[PDB]
Design a protein around this ligand. Structure first.
Ligand SMILES: NC(=O)c1ccc[n+]([C@@H]2O[C@H](COP(=O)([O-])OP(=O)(O)OC[C@H]3O[C@@H](n4cnc5c(N)ncnc54)[C@H](OP(=O)(O)O)[C@@H]3O)[C@@H](O)[C@H]2O)c1
Ligand SMILES: NC(=O)c1ccc[n+]([C@@H]2O[C@H](COP(=O)([O-])OP(=O)(O)OC[C@H]3O[C@@H](n4cnc5c(N)ncnc54)[C@H](OP(=O)(O)O)[C@@H]3O)[C@@H](O)[C@H]2O)c1
Lengths: 285, 285
């Protein structure tokens, strides 16, 4: 398939470069000129307009700054989208992806949302993960092209499924990193190097990953059975963590929300339950 | 060695039970009577006073509610601590452990601080982890007794080292769990079960654990080189996570501190650096 990339920022250039290096006939476009020098040198074709670029591709890959820019560029190319497949690799929300699917359908185009789980430099390597959602046959017809970026993981027909899982994985990653970064700040304040702490932390967190299936079972079942590590005891043990942080001059900012959630769970009567009881406490609607 | 346990709450009873089942001559004490029925039935001896219990053991294991209770009980038994080794398995802070080491030395006793990384039910199984710190020979003379509880990991001569690493590991665990719990709340609000999400999350977080060595290298070196995933882009991508959470009626409480830290890092000029630059931003002293 001939392919088109709209957007030549850091990620867009990596995307186009992976397509070129795989042999796909690739046409690229970007608002600001001078971003396709190496791409054109390697075999790509730089269109002068987005509509031109779109007309030269059966599969249109979009990677712009945000969903608002995306919707603006696409509105300009709406008359030419008919019969093509739109693959939005711009980051966005699940609802924005579902709205784009309906809008694309209104202009005769297929649609897939994508959430890139890798850095630009990893694009094109088999370990690079990109999540996709949308109609299964649309993914099927395009997956060999998407494989140029790395692994292509179809999550389901819901157009918003890729963005949902992308952002949820990011939430899990930022939680883990925030806890690790607080931990290293505590040991740094005591003069202990972070390099020697990493094996202990990795072994520990690897062990903690084994607690996830039981947590998920409790969430889905509503049976918040404890694995001996109950909310009430964990709430009682958090205070030493806060005090030791203050002892070392380390801010408690990263830890306060978990403390409050634990205290709120105890107030709600969940002291004898496991952490699966914490999930529905995050509901605000 | 004859051993003594002070404190028969959930953890203290598990500790004493592991000692009994290993064959150690065990003497136990507790403030409230009636907590040693099964222990005495299995071969333990219940002393009527803490001082009695202490006098019947060369190694005194303490597991009370908190450091304030610990210091009160011990003050009463100070005249009889001479020549014994004190192993405090009550949770506490690094400074409290260092102060107890000095106080114990003042009464002719050796001292080890311990931080229990396992649940009461796992005490006695080889996978149960307890961290220890204090003089290396004191640990050596006692480690075969400590092995009744599970693995005994000596972290160094600093009496506060076990509590420091214990609490740092807890910070990493609570960060990871908070991120996971937010993630499952997002997918739950979309009607997706947590059970099917767990493999993706475990694979993802296992991959993320591979980023730790580079982070630790940057912290120790002060060279906050980016792995392509720079602070500025991660700050720009966090907003979609917040918006998607609001879309699903999910509180953003667990995520706000990481957002603020990222924004603060950008303000401080670290937008092109990796997350290792975030550590020294947590300093308040
Ligand atoms: N890079 C990563 O590490 C990473 C990881 C995962 C996913 N992503 C996602 O990839 C997407 C792009 O990131 P990036 O690294 O490529 O960012 P970037 O380097 O800042 O590039 C932004 C792109 O948007 C274009 N653009 C901005 N405003 C525009 C407008 N008004 N009209 C038309 N085009 C406009 C820019 O074109 P000009 O050259 O004309 O400014 C440029 O091509 C984002 O949605 C991001 O979340 C990135
Ligand atoms: N359990 C866990 O999951 C877990 C995990 C890691 C570490 N730990 C640590 O283990 C320690 C004990 O936890 P636990 O589960 O045993 O708690 P617990 O079941 O609440 O037991 C608390 C103990 O403290 C005693 N105590 C309280 N106030 C006292 C006082 N004024 N004078 C004398 N004794 C007093 C109680 O004796 P009475 O029977 O007379 O009240 C009881 O033996 C804590 O430091 C905790 O952080 C526990």
């Amino acid at each position: 398939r001939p392919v088109t990339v709209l957007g030549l920022g850091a990620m867009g250039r990596a995307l186009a470069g992976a397509l070129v290096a795989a042999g796909h006939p690739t046409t690229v476009w970007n608002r600001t000129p001078g971003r396709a020098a190496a791409l054109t040198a390697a075999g790509a074709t730089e269109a002068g307009t987005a509509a031109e670029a779109v007309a030269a591709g059966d599969l249109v890959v979009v990677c712009l700054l945000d969903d608002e820019v995306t919707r603006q560029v696409l509105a300009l190319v709406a008359p030419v989208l008919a019969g093509r497949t739109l693959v939005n690799l711009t980051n966005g929300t699940p609802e924005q992806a579902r709205r784009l699917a309906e809008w694309a359908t209104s202009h005769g185009a297929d649609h897939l949302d994508g959430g890139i789980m890798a850095v630009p430099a990893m694009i094109g390597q088999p370990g690079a993960l990109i999540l996709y959602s949308g109609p299964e046959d649309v993914f099927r017809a395009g997956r060999e092209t998407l494989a140029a970026f790395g692994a292509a993981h179809w999550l389901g027909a819901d157009p918003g499924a890729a963005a949902l899982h992308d952002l949820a994985l990011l939430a899990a990653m930022y939680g883990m990193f925030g806890g690790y970064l607080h931990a290293v700040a505590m040991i740094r304040a005591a003069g202990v190097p972070a390099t020697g702490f990493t094996p202990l932390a990795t072994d520990w967190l690897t062990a903690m990953l084994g607690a996830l299936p039981a947590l998920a079972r409790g969430v889905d079942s509503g049976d918040h059975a404890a694995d001996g590590s109950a909310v009430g005891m964990q709430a009682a043990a958090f205070g030493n963590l806060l005090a030791a942080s203050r002892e070392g001059g380390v801010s408690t900012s990263l830890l306060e929300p978990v403390r409050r959630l634990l205290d709120d769970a105890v107030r709600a009567g969940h002291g004898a339950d496991g952490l699966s009881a914490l999930v529905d406490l995050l509901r605000q609607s």
